[PDB]
Every structure is written in structure tokens, then in C-alpha cells.
Scaffold this active site. Structure first.
Site, PDB file in Angstrom:
ATOM      1  N   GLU A 272      35.485  38.173  36.140  1.00  0.00           N
ATOM      2  CA  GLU A 272      36.858  38.918  35.304  1.00  0.00           C
ATOM      3  C   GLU A 272      37.061  40.163  35.902  1.00  0.00           C
ATOM      4  O   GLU A 272      37.482  41.122  35.264  1.00  0.00           O
ATOM      5  CB  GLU A 272      36.439  38.794  33.878  1.00  0.00           C
TER       6      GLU A 272
ATOM      7  N   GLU B 116      33.970  29.415  32.558  1.00  0.00           N
ATOM      8  CA  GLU B 116      34.001  29.858  31.222  1.00  0.00           C
ATOM      9  C   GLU B 116      35.261  29.440  30.681  1.00  0.00           C
ATOM     10  O   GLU B 116      36.323  29.467  31.290  1.00  0.00           O
ATOM     11  CB  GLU B 116      33.906  31.466  31.359  1.00  0.00           C
TER      12      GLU B 116
END
Length: 339
Positions: free
Chosen positions: A178, A277
């Protein structure tokens, strides 16, 4: 297609080959997973087999991939005890999982090595404490306090990955995820900002981890995951290059599974692609996981894995886990056949 580490051990090579075949595969082709939690914390978020066992209870299937996270970057430590915030006691269960024919995935919500004690005077740990490009740069300059804590953090991650190596366990290793998001210390300065010098520093940081682990630590068992956030821009601006990356990932949270952006950008890397994820935006138990599995299968067919997060993101705390995990095209534990 061969692993990025030219010294990849047999076990990592045979898994990577098997991952590379699944988009062409007639039958099962989409690997299931769950995040089991954070090594050595209390309560529901702590690592255990509970996340997997609850899915076995709900669906009659154990996820093929079990994920753990080594680090509690949200907690402060004593200055000089920063490696206390990294723990790998989760490894014991991950080894039984590999032995039963599952795959293992490791992330780490790392402390911010720029700050002694991982303590910036903020009211918590430095996990989500931004740092300037100049501050970030010190993590890569020989002899600095930031670089010394960085390597100390890496040593304790490496210790955990070496144990797994020594038990013949390949690892889907997901460092610095991320990174196109503004939240983590290792990520963007801004919301969707195009900072070339942050992008360059991130590439340099990832490469630092790669060579430290590949050369110094002889971590032959790692398949390197590069997983930006699906809901931020400049996804591949952070890509360290084909020589550093084995698996292309997105972290994908949404209330509408069809809304995935980044798919073709990421297929561009020419790597096995996974939603490493996954879960809802709204933690209200309405997310349909069967919809996600079908949406993937029909709209994002190159996708070879989906790993829901734990807590309120778990299929168990949401709708149609059973249908999702019993889809004919889904790979669960017991379904993996490797030469």
C-alpha cells in the site's frame, strides 16, 4: 518464468512455476487465503489458526494460504529495543500449515525506523507517522540511527524468514505494501500525489530489503509480492522493477467488488497477479464473498489468489463464505498438487 532471486531454492521454484500455470488451468485456478493475524498481540487480531478454523466451520474448507504479519508498528518500544515490535512465534503454526499442503504469506506493519523507540511524540507508534523525503533518505545512508534501526528491524524479520527457509517453506513475502497510499510511513506523502523523489526513495528502499535478504541473509525461499492499494493512483510508479518482484498484488477494499481499478496496469508487470488483501469498505457484514469470487473469475481471470483480512473483513463476519469457498474453480487446503 523464474524467481527474482537467482539462488531461489527448489521449494520456492516449484511453487512459482505452479502459480505461473494457474490462469491456463482447466479446473481449479483461484487460491483461497485468510489473514490469521499479528504475531504476539492479544485478542481477535492476534495470530492463531482461529481465522482458518472459523472458515472450516462455516464452509467446510480451510483456506490454501495462511497469512501472518510479524510487526506492531502502532506500538512504541524502548529506544534500542525496536526489534521487540517484530515477533515470529507465528512460524510454528505456518510450518504445520505448509506440512498439510498449504501456502504461507508474511506481511509486517513495520515500526518507523526514523524514530528512536518508534516514538515520534504523536500519542502512538510511528507506523502511520509521515516523514519528509530528507528523513526517508537517511534510512538508506550508511551510519545513521535511522539506517541502524531499519537493519535491526530487518534482522528480526530475516530471523523469522530464515527459520521458515530451514523447514523448507517458501513464503509469499509482502514487504512495504500500500506504498501508493499516504497512511504508512514508507508510503506516499500525499493523497494520489505524483512525488517522483518519494517514488525513487521507495524503489530504493524495497531494493535495499531485496539485496539485504537475498545476499547477506541467503533467503532462497521468498517469492517477493509488490501490492499497492487498489483505491489509490500511481500504483506502478513505486515498482522496483522485474528483477525485484515475483508476484503482482493489489490490496482491494470496496463495497462493490466489480469496481477494481489497477488490473491491467498490474498485469503489465507480466507477473502472477493476486488480490493479496481483500474485504469490504463498510464493516457491517453485508459484503457478498460469493459475488467477489464470481466477479474475479468472470472479470479478472488472471487473478490467482484472494486473501481476505481478519476481524470484520473475514468471510465469516460477512455473506456467502460457504458458496465463495466451494466454487468449483477455487483452490483450498487439500487441493494443491505440485511435482
Amino acid at each position: 518464468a523464474v524467481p527474482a532471486n537467482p539462488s531461489a531454492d527448489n521449494s520456492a521454484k516449484k511453487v512459482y512455476q505452479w502459480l505461473n500455470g494457474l490462469p491456463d488451468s482447466n479446473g481449479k485456478k483461484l487460491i483461497s487465503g485468510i489473514f490469521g493475524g499479528y504475531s504476539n498481540i492479544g485478542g481477535d487480531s492476534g495470530f492463531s489458526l482461529a481465522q482458518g478454523n472459523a472458515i472450516k466451520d462455516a464452509t467446510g474448507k480451510f483456506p490454501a494460504i495462511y497469512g501472518a504479519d510479524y510487526a506492531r508498528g502502532w506500538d512504541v518500544s524502548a529506544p534500542g529495543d525496536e526489534a521487540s515490535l517484530i515477533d515470529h512465534s507465528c512460524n510454528s503454526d505456518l510450518i504445520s500449515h505448509w506440512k498439510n499442503g498449504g501456502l504461507v504469506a508474511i506481511s509486517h506493519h513495520l515500526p518507523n525506523p526514523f524514530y528512536a523507540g518508534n516514538n515520534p511524540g504523536t500519542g502512538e507508534g510511528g507506523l502511520k507517522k509521515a516523514i519528509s523525503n530528507d528523513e526517508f533518505a537517511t534510512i538508506l545512508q550508511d551510519g545513521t540511527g535511522a539506517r541502524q534501526r531499519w537493519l535491526s528491524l530487518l534482522d528480526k524479520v530475516a530471523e523469522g524468514l530464515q527459520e521458515l527457509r530451514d523447514n523448507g517453506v517458501p513464503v509469499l513475502y509482502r514487504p512495504l505494501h500500500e506504498m501508493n497510499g499516504e497512511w504508512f510511513w514508507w508510503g506516499a506523502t500525499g493523497y494520489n500525489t505524483n512525488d517522483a523523489t518519494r517514488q525513487d526513495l521507495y524503489r530504493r528502499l524495497y531494493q535495499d530489503v531485496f539485496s539485504y535478504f537475498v545476499n547477506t541473509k541467503g533467503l532462497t525461499n521468498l517469492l517477493w509480492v509488490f501490492s499497492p492499494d487498489a483505491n489509490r493512483d500511481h500504483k506502478t510508479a513505486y515498482y522496483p522493477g522485474a528483477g525485484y518482484v515475483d508476484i503482482a498484488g493489489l490490496d482491494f477494499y470496496t463495497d462493490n467488488p466489480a469496481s477494481l481499478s489497477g488490473y491491467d496496469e498490474m498485469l503489465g508487470l507480466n507477473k502472477p497477479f493476486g488480490l493479496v488483501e481483500v474485504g469490504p469498505s463498510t464493516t457491517n457484514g453485508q459484503y457478498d464473498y460469493a459475488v467477489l469470487v464470481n466477479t474475479i473469475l468472470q472479470n479478472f481471470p488472471k487473478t490467482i489468489m484472494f486473501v481476505p483480512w481478519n476481524d470484520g473483513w473475514s468471510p465469516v463476519k460477512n455473506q456467502n463464505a460457504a458458496a465463495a469457498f466451494n466454487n468449483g474453480s477455487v483452490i483450498n487446503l487439500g487441493d494443491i498438487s505440485i511435482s
